[PDB]
């Protein structure tokens, strides 16, 4: 199972994801990126069935970049979330469903920061923090315990590291490194990869 | 104006600058191109068809040369105009009657079958890829509520019910003669209606018919099936009007 997490502060969204691609016994890639830049202030974090993740998310990415090319301005992260939800919900009952779990992170200039949970059925939920994978079961209670809405991003990285230390302590799969990015008014920033 | 034209309006079914459709009027001329005339008159308990029957060739099988057509057991028609167009509307009328009985459980009325064939015939006058059928169809039958019904549809798509009707070359003469024999009375019986028909045709034609020169189809309330009279029976009516 593959792990995503987002944390939405006052003026930023902190997202992390496990950096592992596996084939059922072996970690075939230990520097694998699950984050997809939709536009300059939108990340789509995708886990799910193999193949569906990259195909669906590169579909969403080319249509959001095509919106920016057609229009001279970007989609808002709300509009990107509803577009992603709409394509996933339309493909739900088609012949070719996408079994993908999604965190859409985003910073809007007017709306502020925004995080969106999305399960594989395409239920969209705006959330102050959210996570996928089986590690979400271990980490969301720590996030319920320690998150306040006025969290600084330094305390957000410390809380993220508490979640990842819980995954090292208690979770059964080896998830050694975590790609950590942050979105704010200055765009998407690669933070340091939390390693163990 | 006064019958002017501008464009392709004499060649396809589009409007002239007066709002006429010249191809439909030309289909009305194509009815008269056949050179025969049919006359149908409705009684009180009957409805009858008389029509010309020209076999000038004598190698024609006279039983096959007909314009009487059984559409269903109760509804019959005479055709007037171009023969293959007429036979196409006969096949389409038989289809619509059979399909009505299948979809609806009861036999098609004569006004509804004539409305159906007229609504088919309208589409020929609006789409430019086909011409109107140059044929006049006169349906007869017994309605369950209204008794005898004669109905005529045209190349234009106009249908009406008729007390008596005619189609063909002498349609105007037959319309004048039947306005004569309808204003005073309906001249009614099964005997008077089949004789008003044969008198109308042999009056506007002035031929003083033989029984081998016409053919007659009847519907009555007592016998609701569309029945064709034979040469003996038409000969009986010709004896009855030859003695005056």
């Amino acid at each position: 199972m593959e792990y995503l997490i987002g944390i939405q502060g006052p003026d930023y969204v902190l997202v992390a994801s496990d950096r592992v691609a596996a084939s059922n016994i072996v970690q075939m890639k230990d520097d694998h990126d699950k984050m997809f830049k939709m536009s300059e202030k939108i990340l789509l974090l995708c886990v799910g069935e193999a193949g569906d993740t990259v195909q669906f998310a590169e579909y969403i990415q080319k249509n959001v970049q095509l919106y920016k090319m057609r229009n001279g301005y970007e989609l808002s992260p709300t509009a990107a979330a509803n577009f992603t939800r709409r394509n996933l919900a339309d493909c739900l009952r088609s012949r070719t469903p996408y079994h993908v779990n999604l965190l859409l992170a985003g910073y809007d200039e007017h709306e502020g920061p925004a995080l969106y949970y999305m399960d594989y059925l395409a239920a969209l939920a705006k959330a102050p923090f959210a996570a996928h994978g089986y590690g979400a079961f271990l980490t969301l209670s720590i996030l319920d315990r320690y998150y306040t809405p006025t969290i600084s991003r330094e305390r957000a990285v410390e809380l993220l590291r508490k979640c990842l230390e819980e995954l090292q302590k208690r979770f059964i799969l080896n998830l050694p490194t975590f790609s950590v990015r942050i979105i704010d008014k200055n765009g998407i920033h690669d933070l340091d990869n939390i390693s163990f | 104006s006064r019958g002017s034209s501008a464009g392709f309006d004499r060649h396809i079914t589009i409007f002239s600058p007066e709002g006429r459709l010249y191809q439909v009027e030309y289909a009305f001329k194509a009815i008269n191109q056949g050179g025969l005339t049919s006359v149908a008159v409705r009684g009180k308990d009957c409805a009858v068809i008389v029509t010309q029957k020209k076999v000038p060739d004598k190698l024609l099988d006279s039983s096959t040369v007909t314009h009487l057509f059984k559409i269903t057991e109760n509804i019959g028609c005479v055709m007037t105009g171009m023969t293959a167009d007429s036979r196409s509307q006969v096949q389409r009328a038989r289809y619509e009657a059979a399909n009505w009985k299948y979809k609806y459980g009861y036999e098609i009325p004569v006004d509804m079958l004539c409305k159906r064939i007229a609504d088919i015939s309208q589409v020929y006058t609006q789409n430019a890829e086909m011409r109107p059928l140059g044929c006049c169809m006169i349906l007869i039958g017994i309605d369950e509520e209204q008794g005898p019904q004669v109905y005529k549809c045209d190349p234009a798509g106009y249908y009406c019910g008729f007390k008596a009707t005619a189609a063909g070359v002498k349609q105007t003469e037959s319309t004048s003669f039947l306005e004569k024999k309808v204003k005073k009375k309906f001249d009614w019986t099964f005997e008077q209606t089949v004789e008003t028909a044969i008198t109308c045709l042999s009056t506007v034609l002035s031929i003083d018919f033989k029984p081998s020169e016409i053919e007659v189809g009847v519907v009555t309330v007592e016998n609701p099936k569309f029945r064709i009279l034979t040469e003996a029976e038409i000969d009986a009516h010709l004896v009855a009007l030859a003695e005056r």
Binding site: - | K103, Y104, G105, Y106, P109, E144, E145
Partner: protein, 220 residues
């Protein structure tokens, strides 16, 4: 569901219960199960209830087309053909078990139209879950060419037996009497069971329910 109909001397008496169950739980206590088709023809519905709703509304639309086009009074055999040909067209996957009845120029006609598309032209039919209670009352007490009030009493007695003997049936009896001259749609005809009266007064007052946030949004 208990729906039934007889043919009496002058027409049709249809009957239905008013219970709609979702599972073994009463959803509606006042379901309407006798549906308008044409001014002379109604239809009782059992089976999948949305299927009976959409099916009888579609056939009501088709007969309003048919009667505006012919200018006549629609027949029960036409509704019968339309229903059975569509339900056969959809292979029984539309569960519209129907009691069709009406009076035309040819007299009263009653039909039981099963979801696969088979039809039975009978003087008295029952459909639904409590159909065998109602058919017990019908096979017990039917006579040909009964009067109107004898037929109404018979149909409501059969629907009442379905109410008091089937767990999926209950709460009221609707009748729809059709004759050559008249249309009586009786809703409710008989009310067999009432709610037992309340003993304790509760009267939840202002300040009982604690409220976190409150919004007033005025209009015009």
């Amino acid at each position: 569901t208990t729906i039934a109909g007889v043919v009496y001397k002058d027409g049709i008496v249809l009957g239905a219960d008013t219970r709609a169950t979702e599972g073994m739980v009463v959803a509606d206590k006042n379901c309407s199960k006798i549906h308008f088709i044409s001014p002379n023809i109604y239809c009782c519905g059992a089976g999948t209830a949305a299927d009976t709703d959409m099916t009888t509304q579609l056939i009501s639309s088709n007969l309003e087309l048919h009667s505006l086009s012919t200018g006549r009074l629609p027949r029960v055999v036409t509704a019968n053909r339309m229903l059975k040909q569509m339900l056969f067209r959809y292979q029984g996957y539309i569960g519209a078990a129907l009691v069709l009845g009406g009076v035309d120029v040819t007299g009263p006609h009653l039909y039981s139209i099963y979801p696969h598309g088979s039809t039975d032209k009978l003087p008295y039919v029952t459909m639904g879950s409590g159909s065998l209670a109602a058919m017990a009352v019908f096979e017990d007490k039917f006579r040909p060419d009964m009067e109107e009030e004898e037929a109404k009493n018979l149909v409501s007695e059969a629907i009442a037996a379905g109410i008091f003997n089937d767990l999926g049936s209950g709460s009221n009896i609707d009748l729809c009497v059709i004759s050559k001259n008249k249309l009586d749609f009786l809703r409710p005809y008989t009310v067999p069971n009432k709610k037992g009266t309340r003993l304790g007064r509760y009267r939840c007052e202002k300040g009982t329910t604690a409220v976190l946030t409150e919004k007033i949004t005025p209009l015009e």
